[PDB]
Design an enzyme around this catalytic site. Structure first.
Site, short mmCIF file in Angstrom:
data_model
loop_
_atom_site.label_atom_id
_atom_site.label_comp_id
_atom_site.label_asym_id
_atom_site.label_seq_id
_atom_site.Cartn_x
_atom_site.Cartn_y
_atom_site.Cartn_z
CG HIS A 13 76.56 94.21 121.86
ND1 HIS A 13 75.87 94.48 123.03
CD2 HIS A 13 76.75 95.41 121.26
CE1 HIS A 13 75.66 95.78 123.12
NE2 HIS A 13 76.19 96.37 122.06
CG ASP A 84 80.27 95.55 120.02
OD1 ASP A 84 79.73 96.63 119.73
OD2 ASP A 84 79.63 94.55 120.41
CB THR A 106 74.35 96.29 117.37
OG1 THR A 106 74.66 96.71 118.70
CG2 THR A 106 75.49 95.43 116.83
CB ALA A 254 57.30 84.73 124.05
CD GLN A 256 60.72 89.88 120.38
OE1 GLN A 256 61.90 89.51 120.39
NE2 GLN A 256 60.33 91.03 120.91
CD1 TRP A 274 69.11 98.44 116.23
CD2 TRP A 274 67.44 99.92 116.13
NE1 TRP A 274 69.14 99.02 114.99
CE2 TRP A 274 68.12 99.93 114.90
CE3 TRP A 274 66.34 100.78 116.30
CZ2 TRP A 274 67.74 100.76 113.84
CZ3 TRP A 274 65.97 101.60 115.25
CH2 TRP A 274 66.67 101.58 114.04
CB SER A 276 61.92 94.80 120.05
OG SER A 276 62.49 94.01 121.08
CD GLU A 279 63.12 89.58 116.35
OE1 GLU A 279 62.26 89.71 117.24
OE2 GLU A 279 63.90 88.61 116.28
CG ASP A 295 68.77 103.16 122.60
OD1 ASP A 295 68.44 102.35 123.50
OD2 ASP A 295 69.16 102.80 121.47
CD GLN A 296 64.05 100.49 126.47
OE1 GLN A 296 62.92 100.67 126.93
NE2 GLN A 296 64.93 99.68 127.05
#
Length: 378
Positions: A13, A84, A106, A254, A256, A274, A276, A279, A295-296
């Protein structure tokens, strides 16, 4: 004009709050104050001359540093606070200084819409069975709080092109206006770029499962052999490492963003975080969904609902098999059947950049609107 940010004590966050700070500091010259413990702020000290970082020194005792943040606001006195999800006292202490408090979400709007609907409308069923098929207390109230106590609007790290339906649903469920701010964005990395540049365009598949689960020798096998028989170039940031069909394994961090932004990447095998997915969509890289917890999954099908990705088909219940992975990789990145997915990813990327800067600009003007509605009796 002046805003103060109080993210939670987690680097997951701190980055979105810091990027929002950089975005709001370059527009309207908003004076920016970001309240982070010195250890947490230390990582962000690199390109933040625009923002002003403020220290906060404290079962997270965060739930005890109420009066400390009260003192900080008593000194800073920001025109607005952006809090937050877990600080809890943030919205209350801000109102004790007559500071309007706006919540920053977020996470995807749909995942939160799940629980928010189950409260606002107890037995009315989720509006979409395809995404969620609906058919003890001291935490549910603390989830709605940040939505209820948010003044007028709620800022969200999301964009309409991905989940405008769920954002509107969240708007109606919270009775607040959801304001999306879109997405928000060492000598060992030269080998990475030198490898990706010598490969053709949109032929490399970037594989990464964040840092949530290193999987196991049993699960690494099913993805390694699945990448071997996929017969496509890959950068798998974690066969026998020497019969890898044109790939590169990396130990730790890496590039990313730099790999997804490179023109040679045309696939992203991800655990569907999220940030990921955001992006992957800002650079037009379609998504190979391989979620497991949190939540993926909801995120994955989300990107599969709009058509910019595809999930692997689970053959068991704990994990997937190499076929299930190789099939979807070939379908998306190299086969004609995945052209729908690739076309959509690029068109959506163009849109996210075609309506560029306006979303944060509209967010800033609405924040200023909040501040001026508070100019009552001087």
């Amino acid at each position: 004009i002046s805003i103060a940010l109080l993210p939670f004590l987690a680097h997951g966050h701190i980055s979105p709050f810091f990027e929002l700070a950089k975005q709001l500091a370059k527009r309207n010259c908003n004076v920016f104050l970001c309240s982070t413990p010195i250890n947490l702020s230390s990582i962000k000290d690199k390109d933040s001359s625009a923002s002003i970082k403020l220290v906060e020194l404290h079962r997270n005792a965060f739930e005890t540093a109420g009066p400390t943040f009260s003192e900080i606001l008593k000194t800073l006195n920001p025109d607005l606070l952006i809090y937050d999800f877990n600080p809890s006292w943030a919205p209350e202490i801000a109102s004790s200084h007559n500071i309007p408090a706006v919540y920053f979400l977020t996470t995807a709007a749909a995942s939160s819409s799940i629980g928010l609907h189950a409260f606002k409308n107890p037995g009315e069923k989720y509006p979409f069975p395809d995404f969620y098929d609906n058919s003890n207390m001291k935490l549910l109230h603390d989830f709605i709080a940040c939505f209820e106590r948010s003044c007028d609007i709620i800022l969200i790290k999301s964009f309409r092109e991905l989940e405008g339906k769920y954002i509107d649903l969240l708007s109606t469920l919270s009775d607040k206006t959801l304001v999306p701010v879109g997405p928000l964005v060492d000598p060992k990395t030269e080998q990475i770029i030198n490898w990706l540049d010598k490969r053709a365009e949109s032929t490399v598949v970037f594989v990464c499962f964040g840092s949530e689960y290193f999987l196991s020798n049993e699960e690494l096998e099913e993805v390694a052999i699945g990448l071997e028989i996929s017969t496509v170039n890959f950068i798998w940031a974690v066969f026998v490492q020497r019969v890898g069909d044109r790939g590169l394994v990396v130990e730790g961090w890496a590039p990313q963003a730099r790999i997804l932004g490179h023109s040679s990447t045309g696939g992203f095998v991800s655990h569907c975080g999220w940030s990921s997915i955001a992006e992957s969509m800002k650079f037009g890289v379609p998504v190979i969904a391989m979620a497991r917890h949190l939540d993926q999954p909801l995120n994955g099908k989300l990107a599969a609902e709009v058509g910019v990705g595809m999930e692997v088909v689970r053959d068991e219940n704990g994990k997937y098999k190499r076929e299930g992975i190789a099939e979807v990789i070939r379908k998306v990145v190299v086969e004609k059947s995945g052209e729908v997915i690739r076309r959509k990813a690029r068109e959506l990327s163009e849109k996210m950049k075609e309506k560029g800067e306006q979303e944060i600009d509209r967010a800033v003007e609405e924040l200023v609107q909040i501040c001026k509605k508070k100019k009552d009796e001087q």
